[PDB]
Amino acid sequence: SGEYPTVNEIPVGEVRLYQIADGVWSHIATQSFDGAVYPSNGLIVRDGDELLLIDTAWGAKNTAALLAEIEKQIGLPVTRAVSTHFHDDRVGGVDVLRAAGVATYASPSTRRLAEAEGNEIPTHSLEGLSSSGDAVRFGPVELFYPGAAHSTDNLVVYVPSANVLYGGCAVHELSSTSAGNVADADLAEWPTSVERIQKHYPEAEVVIPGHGLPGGLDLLQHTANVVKAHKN
Numbered sequence: 612s613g614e615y616p617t618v619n620e621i622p623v624g625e626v627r628l629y630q631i632a633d634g635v636w637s638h639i640a641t642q643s644f645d646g647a648v649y650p651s652n653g654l655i656v657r658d659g660d661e662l663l664l665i666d667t668a669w670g671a672k673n674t675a676a677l678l679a680e681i682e683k684q685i686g687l688p689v690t691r692a693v694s695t696h697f698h699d700d701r702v703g704g705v706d707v708l709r710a711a712g713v714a715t716y717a718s719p720s721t722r723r724l725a726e727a728e729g730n731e732i733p734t735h736s737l738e739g740l741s742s743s744g745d746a747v748r749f750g751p752v753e754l755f756y757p758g759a760a761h762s763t764d765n766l767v768v769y770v771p772s773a774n775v776l777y778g779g780c781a782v783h784e785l786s787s788t789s790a791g792n793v794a795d796a797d798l799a800e801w802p803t804s805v806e807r808i809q810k811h812y813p814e815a816e817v818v819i820p821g822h823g824l825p826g827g828l829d830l831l832q833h834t835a836n837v838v839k840a841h842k843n
């Protein structure tokens with residue numbers, strides 16, 4: 612009823628949307644992984660009379676439910692999707708999107724890692740993002756590669772019309788006490804990559820983590836703090 616959704620409002624298989632700003636929503640879903648249940652976020656950005664989707668809802672059935680929820684709540688077609696790294700919470704559901712006519716995109720780094728891992732593979736490669744600090748436009752957003760952090764391929768997304776920074780899994784929520792799933796992370800480089808985000812997007816007003824509650828710019832420093840403490 613208006614607060615940011617959590618698993619206690621989200622059975623696995625259901626999707627909720629949350630209005631972030633004019634023409635910007637997050638999507639929230641829950642999934643089971645290794646015997647525990649987790650929430651995860653993605654983004655939806657209005658692109659004229661179409662929608663740009665950032666990240667799947669972590670699974671085929673969740674992503675089908677996401678498309679149905681978008682039709683119910685927004686009613687504009689999702690035409691393109693970008694996955695911000697190669698893990699299942701970002702690409703799991705790409706096959707569903709592709710069969711629903713959505714054009715799916717990711718960096719070549721993400722595509723190679725997804726393929727090697729056996730995860731679903733976005734169709735189209737996003738060039739121009741291979742060096743840290745790189746940025747490219749994609750419809751109503753800017754895609755930015757900050758360097759290795761949560762994963763070597765992680766991208767962040769900025770919505771300039773609303774000063775919304777979608778950090779994906781390189782950014783953690785304020786209540787977090789650990790750095791999440793670090794199996795593919797670079798804990799030593801992560802703070803430097805976060806510093807690059809801070810320098811590039813100093814006017815961000817909303818910061819959205821890959822998992823958990825949005826907040827403000829403090830999520831960036833908090834993420835560096837939790838990562839440094841995990842490393843140590």
Ligand SMILES: C[C@H](OCc1ccc(CN)cc1)c1cccc2c(-c3ccc(CS(C)(=O)=O)c(Cl)c3)c(C(=O)O)[nH]c12
Pocket residue numbers: 644649650698699700761780787789790791792793794795821822823
């Ligand atoms: C889908 C993704 O795959 C990662 C992966 C990597 C490698 C392998 C081996 N090839 C297999 C899978 C995945 C799966 C499960 C958990 C996570 C978490 C996560 C973990 C703990 C917490 C704290 S919490 C809520 O427990 O208190 C939080 Cl927030 C987030 C993240 C994340 O940090 O982004 N990503 C996750």
Ligand SMILES: [Zn+2]
Pocket residue numbers: 696698700761762780
């Ligand atoms: Zn991940």
Ligand SMILES: [Zn+2]
Pocket residue numbers: 651698700780821822
């Ligand atoms: Zn994640």
